[PDB]
Design an enzyme around this catalytic site. Sequence first.
Site: not given
Lengths: 87, 127
Positions: B1, B99, B123, B127
Amino acid sequence: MELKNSISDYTEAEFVQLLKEIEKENVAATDDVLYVLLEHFVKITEHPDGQDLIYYPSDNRDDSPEGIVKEIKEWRAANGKPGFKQG
Amino acid sequence: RNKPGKATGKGKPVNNKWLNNAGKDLGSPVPDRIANKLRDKEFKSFDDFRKKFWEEVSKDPELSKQFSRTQNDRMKVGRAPQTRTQDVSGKRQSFELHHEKPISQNGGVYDMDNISVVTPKRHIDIH
């Protein structure tokens, strides 16, 4: 670039100065200070598009401090709102 | 990461409205022209990648023209461009890199074919 309470305390030239400060903070590593200046910009202009006037300018006007001041002046005038200080 | 790595992928061709569909599903893909400039380049962290990514956008004659002058200044210094006010969310007021496959599952930190650009609202919704 003292943050005035109203657009009426700002001469057009002074507002341009505020915009260049915003352009300066706009290239900093953080947005902390930038976001404060942007919030103030939104509060004083009271323009419905807020900071989009800076990041998403209409193509029917110059993408520059002058274009932003012009669009603000025309929107406030068209709505009978107090404009910039003549100084 | 937050560990180094090489960027890979081909990305996709884009029009004059690259970020138009950015609050869609997976958002806008990494432009193919951008992937070529970043492919096989070593990065210290994803943050370093994101910084370079946006710089490349400002440097691409075709993409930079889709952004205002102030937007271009931000990206030049590695900052993500600001989204339209309508797409913000709290302090998140700029386009974010997503991603498709999380770093945990399959990973793909610098896989440009696993990275897309989404608005803060999108985003949160994905999610």
